[PDB]
Amino acid sequence: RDPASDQMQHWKEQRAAQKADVLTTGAGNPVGDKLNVITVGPRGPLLVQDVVFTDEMAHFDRERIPERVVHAKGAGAFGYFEVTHDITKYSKAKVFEHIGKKTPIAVRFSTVAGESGSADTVRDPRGFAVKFYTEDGNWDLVGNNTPIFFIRDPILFPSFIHSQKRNPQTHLKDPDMVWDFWSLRPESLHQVSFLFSDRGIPDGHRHMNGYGSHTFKLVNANGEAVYCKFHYKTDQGIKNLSVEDAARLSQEDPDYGIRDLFNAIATGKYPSWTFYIQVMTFNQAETFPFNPFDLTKVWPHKDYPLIPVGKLVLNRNPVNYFAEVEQIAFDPSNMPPGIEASPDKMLQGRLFAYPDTHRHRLGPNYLHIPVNCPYRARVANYQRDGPMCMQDNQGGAPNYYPNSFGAPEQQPSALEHSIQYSGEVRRFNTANDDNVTQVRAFYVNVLNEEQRKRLCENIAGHLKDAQIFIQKKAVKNFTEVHPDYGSHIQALLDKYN
Amino acid sequence: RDPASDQMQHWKEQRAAQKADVLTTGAGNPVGDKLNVITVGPRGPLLVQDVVFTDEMAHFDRERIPERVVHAKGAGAFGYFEVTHDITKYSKAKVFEHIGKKTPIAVRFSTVAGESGSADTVRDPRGFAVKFYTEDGNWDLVGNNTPIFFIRDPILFPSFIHSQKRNPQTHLKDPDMVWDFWSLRPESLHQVSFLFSDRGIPDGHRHMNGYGSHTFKLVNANGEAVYCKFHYKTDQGIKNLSVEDAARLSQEDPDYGIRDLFNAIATGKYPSWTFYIQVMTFNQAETFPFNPFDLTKVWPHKDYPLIPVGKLVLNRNPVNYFAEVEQIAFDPSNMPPGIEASPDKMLQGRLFAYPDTHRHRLGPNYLHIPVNCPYRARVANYQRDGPMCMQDNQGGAPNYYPNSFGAPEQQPSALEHSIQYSGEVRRFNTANDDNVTQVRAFYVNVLNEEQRKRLCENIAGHLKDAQIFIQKKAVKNFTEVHPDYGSHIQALLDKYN
Amino acid sequence: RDPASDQMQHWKEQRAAQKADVLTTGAGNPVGDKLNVITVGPRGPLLVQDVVFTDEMAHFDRERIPERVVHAKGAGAFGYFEVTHDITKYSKAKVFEHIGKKTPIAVRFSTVAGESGSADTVRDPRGFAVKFYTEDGNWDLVGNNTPIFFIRDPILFPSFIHSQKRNPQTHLKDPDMVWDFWSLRPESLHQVSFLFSDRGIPDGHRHMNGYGSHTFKLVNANGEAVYCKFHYKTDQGIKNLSVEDAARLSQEDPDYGIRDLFNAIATGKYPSWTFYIQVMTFNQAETFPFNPFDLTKVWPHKDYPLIPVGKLVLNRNPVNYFAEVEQIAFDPSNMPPGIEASPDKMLQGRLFAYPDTHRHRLGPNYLHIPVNCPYRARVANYQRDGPMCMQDNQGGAPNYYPNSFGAPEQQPSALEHSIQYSGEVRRFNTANDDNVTQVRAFYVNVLNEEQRKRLCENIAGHLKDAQIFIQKKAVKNFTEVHPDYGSHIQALLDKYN
Amino acid sequence: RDPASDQMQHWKEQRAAQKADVLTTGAGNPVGDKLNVITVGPRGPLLVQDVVFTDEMAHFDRERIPERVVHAKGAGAFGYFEVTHDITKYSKAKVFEHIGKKTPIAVRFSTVAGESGSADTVRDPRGFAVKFYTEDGNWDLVGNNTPIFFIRDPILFPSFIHSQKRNPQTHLKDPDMVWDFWSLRPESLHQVSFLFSDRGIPDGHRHMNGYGSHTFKLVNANGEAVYCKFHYKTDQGIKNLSVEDAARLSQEDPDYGIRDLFNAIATGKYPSWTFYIQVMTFNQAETFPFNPFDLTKVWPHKDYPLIPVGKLVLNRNPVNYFAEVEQIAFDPSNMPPGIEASPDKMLQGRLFAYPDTHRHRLGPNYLHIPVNCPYRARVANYQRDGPMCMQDNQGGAPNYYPNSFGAPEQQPSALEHSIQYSGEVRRFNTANDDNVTQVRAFYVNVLNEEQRKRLCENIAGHLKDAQIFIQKKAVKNFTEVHPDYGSHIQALLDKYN
Numbered sequence A, B, C, D: 001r002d003p004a005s006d007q008m009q010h011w012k013e014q015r016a017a018q019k020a021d022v023l024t025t026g027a028g029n030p031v032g033d034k035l036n037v038i039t040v041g042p043r044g045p046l047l048v049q050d051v052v053f054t055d056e057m058a059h060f061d062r063e064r065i066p067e068r069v070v071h072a073k074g075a076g077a078f079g080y081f082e083v084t085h086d087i088t089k090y091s092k093a094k095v096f097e098h099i100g101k102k103t104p105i106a107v108r109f110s111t112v113a114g115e116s117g118s119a120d121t122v123r124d125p126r127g128f129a130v131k132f133y134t135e136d137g138n139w140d141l142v143g144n145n146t147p148i149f150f151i152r153d154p155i156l157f158p159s160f161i162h163s164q165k166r167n168p169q170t171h172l173k174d175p176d177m178v179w180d181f182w183s184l185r186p187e188s189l190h191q192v193s194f195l196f197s198d199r200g201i202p203d204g205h206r207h208m209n210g211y212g213s214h215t216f217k218l219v220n221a222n223g224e225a226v227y228c229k230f231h232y233k234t235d236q237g238i239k240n241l242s243v244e245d246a247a248r249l250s251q252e253d254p255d256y257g258i259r260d261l262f263n264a265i266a267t268g269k270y271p272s273w274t275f276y277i278q279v280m281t282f283n284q285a286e287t288f289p290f291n292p293f294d295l296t297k298v299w300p301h302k303d304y305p306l307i308p309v310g311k312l313v314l315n316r317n318p319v320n321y322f323a324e325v326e327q328i329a330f331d332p333s334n335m336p337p338g339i340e341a342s343p344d345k346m347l348q349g350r351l352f353a354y355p356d357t358h359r360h361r362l363g364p365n366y367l368h369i370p371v372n373c374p375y376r377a378r379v380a381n382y383q384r385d386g387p388m389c390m391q392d393n394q395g396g397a398p399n400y401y402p403n404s405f406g407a408p409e410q411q412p413s414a415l416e417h418s419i420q421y422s423g424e425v426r427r428f429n430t431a432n433d434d435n436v437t438q439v440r441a442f443y444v445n446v447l448n449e450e451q452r453k454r455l456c457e458n459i460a461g462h463l464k465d466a467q468i469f470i471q472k473k474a475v476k477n478f479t480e481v482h483p484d485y486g487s488h489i490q491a492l493l494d495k496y497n
């Protein structure tokens, strides 16, 4: 059998030649018997003094924590990030200090809309989150398998996710909801085209690219700032499942990506991604034809070539899935000195959203969870007492700042990069921005004829379930992108009806 | 389209001719705009004073509650229970007071081992829980589609569920775990035979029987006690999917049972179950060949014929799934006067387990949730303050008992039925009880030849993945049940290998 | 006896002539007996089937919620806000629509640093929070008995509260911590002078003023904006306890303020506060000698006279303290149209802090708690599912925006007031701002000689416990305010040593 | 100053000669500045990208956990238990293995009815809980400063605590509630007499005795069982405060016991208690004049002399109070092999109540908290996944039992002691048991004349506030105990009225 199937036999084999441990309660008291319960004779009612029973059962009753509101279904792996090129001129980050520096990483792959127990091989954006354990605290590059997203304003994210997920009454997937939202929000045409292309259903997690998707800000030691986009492209090469194969695997193995990643790492075939960046100066940002902080836009490779930085290798499988993969938390706000946020509205929304949801899901002290701890750095601050605190709680150190007792002091070299912003403080409309230019470019330059046909059949296959007026509004947006794109979808929809 | 697909259009149509409501915050403050966020000009960072954004997002971040540790994937419906026969001689329950009495009910169907988002049409025991809103508080008949269970001692339940669910390292379904547990626990042969028969994969929730599965105690007004088993058999008739059809539906519609029940109720075809009971006297219980409180045994129909009581009709679909189906809590401990627990160890374990898990999942005051409230009864007691209390908290009534201020008094007519139990208070072994007699009876009397062949191919198909020694231990147990049963499985396993 | 002592007798008297209600479980099942537990004979162990016991006990085990991180000890009352003057030229708020309009209010009085069960009559700032149930959602004026605060930057608030509260090792009140923080932060001199004056220990909650303390922004129907400060001064007149009387009452009645407010409302003597405002134009704000958004500064009455608006009357006592006072949540972010936030950094910090802590303390759906609900307004939005949801969860309404099914639409008349802000986006130092001018004014104009002497003895009495260097740093700050102020404290400290 | 006051200076002195640590976020990212917030210029609104602010504040908002439902106000200390005598004939416990064996202990002192921040020096039963870190898991002797309690049935405990605590409407202490409950429950006369004697207000925690109060069961290696009562009497001698001194200290130092214990341990004066036991055979238990498992009765010293076992010494103060004292959990169910529960109904109720409340207060995985961990024992079991899990979660070990992969096995030598119990399974009344015999004995043998007078004045002083009929019912119970006892109280009450 494959290494995944032989987990228990491998556990037994690695622990051969030693006697079984003593079965104990949570409090370490040895258990006399855990196959029978205390009764008033052979056919008597259960006793309260059955402390072993009530302890076991009570713990069983509290096993489930809340699933992630998005990217619930996931697969986890560990490894390192190796620097191969010098980008010290761009960033002063300790992760990019010198060439050959290895930083340990934790990675989680996921499907955005799928719940815990849903099929892996489905058409959906794939999450690609990376946690760098840097000497200057954790760095969380929370990325996707796509360089863009559907929307450009973070207030629409809850709406988008509600439309992608189940109907509130019927609890069913509603193409009506999906295509109503997408037809009303035409800035999603670019991401929709990517999603319904061949790379919508990647063959496992090893054969997909990864993108930060946001514009980030790199600051050097001299104090100069530039703009960045992180790319981590697969070294195993892009490889995708057909709709028929994906449909087969959905019933055959709904845990295809978990099994594929576990077997790949277990057999020694360590998957690797090459870390690239694009650089954009402040004058280039001001003279960019589009909004350079727009999440629905990309930076063309001819104007902004990829600059190699390093490689990401995954070599270690999780020991316990719940402890290392279910409980791992990725905060985009976790950025070390040299890396900062850009004015990208979406990124600004993510800075709040993640720590808030982590306090709900995992708990107030979720950063004390071993996988979440910045173990390669020293934490010292005036943050004290919360529920489930598993540290000394910084012992008897003064818990107020400023003080006169040598408590932790602020480091002035870790200040943020200052910038002057113009205009009023109000709500600016971005729905009426360019929605079709880069979509047309992708359609008529990147895709070939058979790829365009497959794209149109995939969209038409999903969109046929929506109401007539929603189909018309969707096809109108596809026609405004390109007339052949719209006409082909419309022809297929007419065939389907 | 089907009624399920037209949920939004039906919502719009029923609310036609009125203007859209004002979009407000949680605190009822009208929202100016919820499509854009407040920025420092068109390309500026997000402001903290964007209260609308942070409120929406914070609520979005806290949407997920923990799924049920078991029976996570479920479908909900509402209706009534109509009494058709007089059983007042057996029980003094207000639910069975007089003929033609309608008690409102809430029902939830489920798959035991499936997570939220797993396929509906899979081989697994189906949950069939019924909540009777009786005038003497709620009655929760938390039943299955099978009259028996796998185990007879409640301390093994967490072990059984862990074996049925994912591997702790790989997070994959492990036939190794499933068949190791089943082979080591041969009292599961009866339930295994039922599970791998044709009724393992019922065609939706309308074409399956329901059983309390436990022995219950009926007490009449005179104070005499008897033993009972609740049966609720389908009026639509038993109907099952083939393995191939089930495998197809798993990828086609993973929400087959939710869609089927919603469409059935929406179109007017109300499904119904006929409520039966078996009665066993205390002398019959003492002279029963087996343990009558053994959950792996049934009461034969020739010795204990079914006595009709009433019918269960489901006529109303849930308005909101989360509010009415996700948050519904069924406590087997919720039993009105006239219905009591028997010495069945499993039932004794369920009396503790359910209220404990409900306090974790839903919260301390989960009985204040509308679907969980005993709205057809008056609650008055000395239970006060907890988190998320949405009552007057019983106002200014004395909160101690006994008192001298006319606070709620105990009703002496609601006392439990007293019984003398013999033997020591210790752990009695029940693993070595009869495990094969009723299994043989079922195999060679109920099933025909083609049903026996399908049963053997289904078991062999699942068991082939297990290690050789586990296959041998499983086949040995099947051989001890019946030599043809064991030999046929072994022949198919040899073919598979 | 006083009305407070006769609560139970009054309950009995108002419910005379009716029989005691039936004692039930949470699930409404009548209790047979709740004075004895089920045992295996007279001297036998307790049974698990004692469902009544385990239900009662389990609810008892979950009674405590987390106390407020600050203002834990509190007293609650209800009444109304009556408009007496027209300020429609300043604000378009429905609370200020027309003269004679009564809005129901909920008020909570509190001590900032005291825990639940601490003494009422102690030297500490008193909280004065008011919840207006306006037709445009709830308005929460979360005020103090002082027009200023200790600090002017919200990042120092956790530090300030940690210094005021117990030592992390010893769990004792530490004057060392208090005076170290106050000596290092000399912008606290103004609030310290107010706190150690006669009005530090007010005689109950009826004899103290209330202030919003922040600069707020009033917007009229025409769209013009001004700046505001809310004052609500006592109609019963300012009245204070001596240090000796306060020290006596601390042991005699630690619940002096709760008893005083309950008896005052119960006997019919309804306390009232007169609602005033100060108005500041944008040109006046730009030409103000100090920062007009500085929380440590006041607006002088000669330059900015008080403008009457209405009166606050408290007429109803809480029915249940836990339900109505412990669980009440005041969000400064809850502001109806016509009232907005100013650039006051402290207010900006409060906009985030309160909803975040409420989700922790009370729970995600804390606005479903009756006292927190905006019951005089209609809530409709795309916020769905959370723990402990006790609404229809907005039934089957579309849960995404924008949509095409007539779901709640944004009201364009409720937009925020736009303003252009100059300067870079960075951290600006405000520690070096004016700290002594208004403190000197208060010392040498408002206070008389005997009031100055009492102020100095109160400060010296508290400060004597601190280390010598902290005493020197504190006295230096008092000397920089005024030489007589510093010299008198120093003389008293030398006497104490 | 005393060592308690010099905590911060001692921290500074022990960490002298090293530079202050770098101020970091929770994620270990160095903080640039934590005195100012990011604004849009000097007088601009706060930015969302202020990650340092929102992290600090969010953690501050989640500092409070629920206080203990009882014994909220507490003081903690650590040390060891040294065996001085051989009791191996009675118990096979590893804590009592051999003479001179030192087991580390954690102790918490407390006041039963006081909230967090209430006065220490008040008339109330004092908690005396001891956590033995035995090699066979933790042993929690959760005791009081009194050998008895008020009630003998655990279903009345929530009622008793509600009566002792605040009124549900007024939130005030109600002598009406206290004396109504005590007058209706005359089995409290013994504990009431002890409480209103001189030992009601002990001088700190070092000058009070400690009792298990329950009958426990000692089992030896041979398998013989006896009954036990644990006594731990002070080596510093019994010492009490007068009512006047206690009333003074209530305002002077409400944290008298915390300061006293901290200073005692800090100066080197380690307090010690001598561990005694009483032994009762099964024949003696059957021929005892009273119920030997009755919590309101004692075992007379003449019939059952004290047998020395060892001494309890407290030598170490807590480093952090929240981590070591607030979060410590004592489970009476935590009993190592050789120590078991008796049929005492109260003890049976405590076996359920404590683990249930700990899961609410601290969380499901509260035994992972360092102070709660059985660090001197190895925990291995099939308890997996819960919220806030900070272990490997037992890695990849099989999570079901029984199994075939060498997972932890049950130890047959740790079985419970079996006993045959007679009588029916129902609710037996114990309210009508003897309530006056041992109370009379205590009154007329132990107390002298001036002690009897003080006892009567203390009761009369508290009882005068109750209604006339409650005073009559209380005095009647005191008269039934002894006519002089009743007559003296009545005379003082008549004087008070």
Ligand code: HEM
Residues within 6 Å of the ligand: C067, C068, C069, C070, C071, C074, C108, C109, C110, C126, C127, C128, C129, C142, C143, C144, C149, C153, C154, C155, C157, C211, C212, C213, C214, C328, C329, C330, C346, C347, C349, C350, C353, C354, C357, C358, C361, D061
């Ligand atoms: C940066 C500044 C401040 C922060 C971070 C802050 C934070 C908090 C927090 C977390 C609470 C607990 C609320 C709960 O859990 O129920 C609270 C309560 C309170 N705060 Fe503040 N606060 C600030 C400034 C002020 C100011 C300036 C005032 C008055 C002028 C004030 C008055 C109050 C009052 C009255 C309460 C109690 C509310 C109640 O009755 O429930 N606070 N504050």
